[PDB]
Symmetry: D3
Subunit: 242 residues, 6 copies
């Protein structure tokens, strides 16, 4: 028909449905584990690349610090490039300094105790890295060295192996690591999303209501508190030139 009545709710439905279908497709179409993971990870990266403010980059990467320690391979890194160099780039493959990182996520097909623990380990391999911070020159003078921002960590999946999907067994698994490996938020595209409440010191699960869109908004809102990354001391990395 010729009726036209704009709906904001429909936009958020369509945003989520696109993610859910493409993740379902990646799982069903690719019967090779490498291709299936690459396909799914790309769906999440495209969502962040499309919708996050441009102050954020989103890509697969290794993280490195000025002590010469490296993270594991991170499926989805959210990081700064406005104020931060790459440490190494070779064609499309990138290694980013720890000081550039805002958030790190593991992306897999279905939530489980083993996957949650694996994600907790990936996140810990980033949070253990050392980050420098120098006083920051700006138009109004020089700020003190910014105190180190929290790196957000999380888990992104299509499905859940538990029944109910987002129940006590998921909660138990999340409480397995409340320090270096703590997962601040995550999304189960077929069911809902979760986040850690700092005030109550507990995990909250939110069911349905456009899970991928709700996760995206939660990520944007939480990132706002981080402001910009602290200012990197590239000469700390330069000790390794000799």
């Amino acid at each position: 028909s010729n009726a036209s009545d704009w709906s904001l709710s429909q936009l958020f439905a369509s945003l989520h449905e696109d993610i859910q279908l493409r993740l379902g497709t990646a799982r069903k179409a690719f019967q090779h584990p490498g291709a299936k993971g690459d396909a799914s990870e790309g769906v999440w990266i495209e969502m962040l690349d499309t919708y996050l403010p441009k102050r954020y980059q989103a890509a697969n990467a290794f993280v490195v610090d000025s002590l010469g320690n490296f993270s594991d391979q991170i499926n989805v890194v959210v990081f700064d490039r406005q104020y931060s160099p790459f440490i190494f780039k070779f064609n499309e493959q990138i290694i980013v300094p720890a000081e550039s990182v805002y958030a790190v996520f593991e992306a897999k097909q279905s939530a489980s105790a083993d996957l949650v623990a694996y994600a907790q380990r990936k996140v810990a391999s980033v949070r253990r890295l050392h980050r420098t911070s120098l006083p920051i020159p700006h138009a109004g003078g020089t700020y003190p060295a910014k105190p180190l921002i929290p790196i957000l960590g999380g888990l992104l999946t299509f499905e859940s192996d538990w029944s109910p999907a987002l129940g006590m067994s998921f909660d138990k698994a999340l409480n397995g690591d409340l320090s270096d490996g703590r997962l601040d938020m995550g999304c189960v595209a077929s069911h809902g999303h979760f986040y850690f409440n700092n005030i109550d010191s507990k995990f909250n699960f939110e069911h349905g209501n456009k899970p991928a869109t709700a996760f995206l908004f939660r990520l944007i809102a939480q990132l706002q508190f981080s402001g910009t990354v602290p200012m990197i001391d590239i000469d700390a990395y330069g000790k390794w030139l000799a």
Copy 2:
């Protein structure tokens, strides 16, 4: 999903099209934006999957006698051997000689829309096409006899119930000469094509409609080979 499946690949190709056409229709509550969204989905399918000898875009078509077509939502045309007549950023005018196929893309099939599509197809087929002898590695071919331009209609839905039944068949039989549609797709229901042997339209229900249409188009395009060789000096008569 135990193992690789061609059926699954073709289902996923179609489901992507069906869902994005539905998103275009639901999300964009403005007639211009809704049309642009839906047309872009169909163009993207053609751009991704057609052999690279084919271009797919929105364009006007014009001939060397100064006859212009209406704006065509989805033109399939040659660029390997054919110039543009005019390009201004994203707006293109292509010579009639370059055209392989023309489609109208809309939300839902109806008697008015089938007729509209037939008229659009006829407007392109009525344009004059030059054809020169063709130099090639082995010598010079005689001028290629003119290829038929394929025509069709692409929609998300059908206004009829049943969607792809006798009323649709009646509309398609409304133009059996230079507006005749060769094929088309209703993403939510099936596809149709003209069967030249039986001189009748056939409908195929379900069975991955967008992918079925894509394959029908590729197979039929093969018979056209490459476009005839344009006489650009026929257009050059308008320089003076």
Copy 3:
């Protein structure tokens, strides 16, 4: 000859002449109203995309707010993406939040009383939208919520239907809407440009002297006063997830 004497004035002449010719071409070559408008609008967008500082995006878009209200289709939106998400993106089509908007313009072929009023209505459909504003975390602490910036509005044309082109009838039309629909500035590529003087509370017309370049500089200078958009409350949009 082999003479070389750089001229800054010539650069600004060439910048304007390019715009004037391409707008004239769009009008003459495309005898289909949709194609003609798309061609012309693209000329103005390319000028802004080429020359504006990269903190500004310029594109055709719909604007939406956290109350679920939508603007009309805006030919030329100038908006933030460094700090602002898209609300929806589908291939090249975008819907931006009201909080991201710096300026909105209507682009048409020739200035007239009807076109000025139409542009005033387009601008009003944006200014009526609600914009959130949160306290802003930064390297030096937290700023108060930034007071809402003015959205600049305007009209971009190739020609004028009036004789003289930029005379009292144009002035009358501009004074038709001095609130939600007020046009702050605009350009008539073949004749000159206009702007509203806040101190004198009157419209000023400037004839010739590279109209498109003069408009571009006026826009850059006025945008500088706006600083960056206020910080969006994406959770205000998230009320529509349920």
Copy 4:
């Protein structure tokens, strides 16, 4: 401007070229930058409008015997069947076998510049081109006889008054063997071409000079068909 017009489309195509070449000349008051600006306008015209079987770029040309050309402002060449000999970011060296046409692009025609262009064209035509039997769907063609390489000059203005008169004609008749120019364009005035039937140069005044030249080039290129099939192992003799 009541209705669509091919004449208007061709006028707008030309006016865009003429104005941007004038901008390049006026705005960039540095000889390197001015040349780069003007050359890029001509390359953009060719890139936009030539059939995609043609590439257009600045390049050096080299043959399998180690003979190198000078740097050529505008080379029209094949990539569908031809490798690069060397590419380093934006700098390319193409095999002689890939070349369809070579142009010098400068600000204003003059006796010195016509001669310069003739010399550049001869330097490419003097390079050796291999040609092997060509496998194709129907079998194997004999080696294609070598295609003539087209040569020309592209400018914004003319130093002469009249712009395209007897002095220009005298300069063009200065090289009637391997430096002979086939065609060229003076954007502000007209275009020229060698008429093989009359064995004389012809000038066409006004009537959308850049577009007229574009069409002349497309029509003449058609006679060349595709480049001969390169013997890359002739170049491979230099591996040892």
Copy 5:
């Protein structure tokens, strides 16, 4: 470096490949990332220098009977006349009919890796390829007889000492039927190819190994001409 040199251009082409493959191996201390880095170097060489009639990418291959290959590091295939079977962002599945050549790219040659490559090549050659009569400007060709699919191995180093000696020769003679390798490159040492006349493998030492391999590949590909014309309706049997 007094003057232009084809030998130098070919040395620089090779040195770029050799150094970047060594960088991939040294710098990326993770097996997935190391492989991705090295594979991308070889793909970039092919993308830059092969004629544009060839695509080069990582892909799965599938046929119209539902037989799927393993993931192939470097597939050389047609897109001018061939659709994708499936594309999802960067992941592609190509029809067997589109394939010209298949390579495995790894760090260092070894008996296990030569065997692995032979198996990968056989898996693609065992897939069924359709071939239809081909419409063209002059009429219709008979269906093109199936082209041989070229196979090979690309590495940076060799595990053997000598690098390209009898042990390598023994490994290559391990598969002389549908897994037989046609050619390959060891960037640090040389290249190899199967000599059909002598029915033996030949090794070429030094003399710009990557460039020598590139030229060998281009020359051999020429004999294949273009892929046969796919019957997409054979794939369409899986729509139901």
Copy 6:
């Protein structure tokens, strides 16, 4: 083998070796002086484009100021576009305002007294230009006009004509211009890098230890002190519209 032990030192080695080889290739392969220079200059530009924070642009350009004066052609300009327009852009050719410039470099094949003096002249042609600076609106109010930042100047080469490469004759040449033409830093890819020490008011040479990487880090660290360019007064350029 299957061993995996990440090394930060190796990344910096590979970064430098890539530059050294590609510069060596440009010199050896292209026996035409224009092509050879274009090839080499492109190597340095790609390094800066790849690794510098995205607040910096790196390209070949002419610089112009609001008095209508122009620099010479600058091989490698590092400049702002986040807050700065182009003055003119024609296809890929750009003219940038002086207010946008952070650093300027000359790139040539081999260091020599003549090349150092030529580079000093290029740098001086930029530093002599006039730069405006306006009070800066931001989320916290209005900063005073930022005091003009130093423009960094330098020389980038593959080789040195002197033996030793980085010896007293290089030092003498560098001390030829300690004002408008002073070279703050530079790189000789085959040998080392140099920088001016402000405290000691002398030039320092550092040999080997990944020269291009050491130069890159020195540039990043020094640029940090400059903060963002001052805010341009585009209306100063607008005086040339009439």
